[PDB]
Design a protein around this ligand. Structure first.
Ligand SMILES: *[C@@H]1O[C@H](CO)[C@@H](O[C@@H]2O[C@H](CO)[C@@H](O[C@@H]3O[C@H](CO)[C@@H](O)[C@H](O[C@H]4O[C@H](CO)[C@@H](O)[C@H](O)[C@@H]4O)[C@@H]3O)[C@H](O)[C@H]2NC(C)=O)[C@H](O)[C@H]1NC(C)=O
Lengths: 48, 48, 32, 48, 128, 289
């Protein structure tokens, strides 16, 4: 059940696809999209 | 004035200029046996 | 304006001998 | 040891390397046991 | 909330020595400066000295420099004002003063207390 | 009523009164903060005293103060002055006196209010183009104030001096190369122009060494007459991710805002310039201390 086994690699690929789907959601919360901060509390604190 | 312990080990020093002044970095006082440089002084020099 | 100390009172500076060719050795320590 | 500055020119006899206005100077002292940093005007002394 | 009270005032022969007290209360933070003033009747106020609390360093005005001495008890946080070798020109009401900040007293005693926020009741002194 | 209930928001989406067996996930319960934690510098205050004594320099020799690892009270400083104009970018005028930063920079000079329109980067003029320019990245504030009569120790200067030309004369002696000022930097011409311009329209020039590229540096200072009371300008810049300490306002030091007491429950935290919500735990040290 090593890396040379090509069906085992497909099993791992499917698991990795699940993980990447979740990680993009988790990682897009630190994006600012051009705002002064990616935190709503920071924006509320700093501006009017 | 900054006191220096006397030894014979490899050391790293660094200097940069920002709007906050002139920053001095050295390997001593934080990472003596590695070489990572951490700021230890900011001098009030504002002409570039 | 801090007081850096007593101004030096000597009359003449020591004689300095520039010989660049004695210091032209090559020991490379490149960034790694 | 270092001399740092914002304007540079030549001495009386045409030799390059004179810093004009306030100059930052970093000198070790104490047989390499302290570092002394100052920032001021170096007026060349006369004499031999 | 902050209360400043001067005490110890009285009349002594000119060229004598005297010491006030200025009880201070209502500070929740140790970063403040306390100054001494005097008011001669029928004129404007003018400052004498101040103490900067966390640092502990003190300064005095030109007129009474050296003649006066300021200090503070480490357990009572009360400031003093020691006069020595008093003169007839030193008859006035001594005021205590304080501020929210820590860096205003130097400008304050040289601008008759423009920056202060806290004032004491005062204590009249007259020299015979 | 859409927000009444879980079934209510079930119905308001699907736009219907007879939602099918639609087995949602619905909105989640989020924890409420049972406490608040604050850490900051203790027993040290940002020191604005140098701003109070002495002659304030011109716009082109503005003096800079840099504060880190201290507690500040900007309201006290602004109370001692008669505030004419007070405008901030990327920060609000109420926020600049109440937020935590890593470094605060206060540049002050002598400025006559007549050229208020020359301080914004828009409407370039001679001030923002040769004398003083604020960075476009960090949040900034700009203050125009007048010192009152009762404040004695600010020694009024003799006139309002300011640069109008700072330019470089190339070796061809034909081309003129303007020297624009870079944000948070002194103009290149401050080395030749004196602190106070003696006469409106004077000229200054110096010859640059070949190390500096040769050529000539030519500058000219204009003057605006004094006022009855001195008018000054303040520029404030704040930085966020630069120090391990912070510049914070002063609080009341009799509270229970300690990490070691509220260990394990949801809390607001304002450890330093950084703040948020979370749960703390005793835990083995892992980074660089
Ligand atoms: C941060 O700085 C701000 C700005 O100064 C500071 O708020 C100020 O607090 C002072 C506290 O004294 C206020 O001063 C008062 O002003 C009134 C006039 O409006 C005076 O009459 C008052 O003096 C009387 O009361 C004192 C006791 O309260 C007596 O001791 C005194 O002898 C007088 O009888 C009083 O001085 C000032 O108005 C405010 N200013 C503003 C803009 O709010 C704040 O406290 C600082 N923060 C911290 C944490 O230190």
């Amino acid at each position: 059940f090593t890396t040379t086994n090509e069906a085992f690699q497909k099993v791992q690929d499917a698991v990795n696809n699940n993980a990447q789907a979740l990680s993009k959601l988790a990682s897009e919360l630190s994006n600012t999209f051009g705002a002064i901060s990616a935190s709503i509390g920071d924006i509320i604190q700093r501006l009017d | 004035t900054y006191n220096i312990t006397e030894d014979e080990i490899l050391e790293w020093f660094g200097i940069t200029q920002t709007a906050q002044g002139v920053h001095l970095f050295s390997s001593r006082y934080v990472d003596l046996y590695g070489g990572n440089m951490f700021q230890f002084a900011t001098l009030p020099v504002y002409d570039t | 304006y801090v007081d850096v100390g007593p101004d030096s009172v000597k009359s003449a500076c020591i004689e300095v001998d520039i010989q660049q060719t004695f210091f032209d050795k090559t020991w490379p320590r490149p960034i790694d | 040891a270092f001399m740092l500055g914002s304007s540079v020119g030549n001495f009386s006899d045409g030799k390059m390397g004179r810093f004009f206005n306030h100059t930052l100077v970093l000198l070790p002292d104490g047989c390499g046991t302290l570092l002394r940093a100052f920032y001021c005007i170096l007026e060349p002394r006369s004499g031999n | 909330q902050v209360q400043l009270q001067e005490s110890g005032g009285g009349s002594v022969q000119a060229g004598g020595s005297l010491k006030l007290s200025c009880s201070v209360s209502g500070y929740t933070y140790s970063t403040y400066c306390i100054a001494w003033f005097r008011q001669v009747p029928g004129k404007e106020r003018e400052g004498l000295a101040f103490i900067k609390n966390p640092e502990g360093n003190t300064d005095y005005a030109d007129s009474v420099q050296g003649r006066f001495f300021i200090s503070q008890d480490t357990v009572d946080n009360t400031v003093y004002l020691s006069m020595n070798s008093l003169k007839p020109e030193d008859t006035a009401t001594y005021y205590c003063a304080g501020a929210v900040s820590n860096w205003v007293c130097g400008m304050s005693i040289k601008s008759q207390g423009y920056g202060m926020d806290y004032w004491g009741k005062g204590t009249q002194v007259t020299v015979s | 009523d859409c927000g009444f209930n879980d079934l209510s928001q079930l119905h308001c989406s699907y736009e219907s009164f007879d939602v099918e067996s639609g087995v949602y996930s619905v909105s989640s319960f989020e924890a409420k903060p049972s406490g608040s934690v604050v850490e900051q510098a203790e027993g040290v205050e940002c020191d604005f005293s140098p701003l109070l004594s002495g002659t304030p320099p011109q716009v082109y020799n503005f003096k800079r103060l840099v504060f880190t690892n201290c507690n500040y009270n900007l309201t006290k400083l602004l109370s001692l002055f008669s505030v004419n104009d007070f405008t901030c970018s990327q920060i609000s005028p109420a926020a600049i006196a109440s937020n935590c930063y890593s470094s605060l920079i206060l540049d002050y000079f002598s400025y006559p209010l007549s050229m208020k329109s020359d301080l914004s980067v828009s409407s370039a003029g001679p001030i923002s183009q040769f004398n003083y320019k604020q960075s476009f990245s960090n949040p900034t504030c700009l203050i125009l104030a007048t010192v009152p009569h009762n404040l004695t120790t600010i020694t009024k200067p003799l006139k309002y001096s300011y640069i109008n030309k700072c330019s470089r004369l190339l070796s061809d002696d034909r081309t003129e190369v303007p020297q624009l000022v870079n944000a948070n930097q002194y103009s290149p011409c401050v080395s030749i122009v004196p602190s106070t311009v003696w006469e409106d329209g004077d000229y200054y020039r110096k010859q640059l060494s070949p190390l500096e590229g040769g050529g000539w540096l030519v500058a000219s200072g204009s003057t605006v007459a004094m006022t009855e009371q001195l008018q000054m300008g303040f520029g404030i810049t704040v930085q966020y991710g630069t120090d391990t300490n912070s510049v914070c306002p002063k609080l009341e030091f009799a509270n229970d805002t300690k990490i070691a007491s509220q260990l394990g429950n949801c809390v607001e935290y304002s450890l330093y310039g950084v703040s948020g919500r979370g749960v703390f735990q005793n835990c083995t040290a892992v980074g660089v201390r």
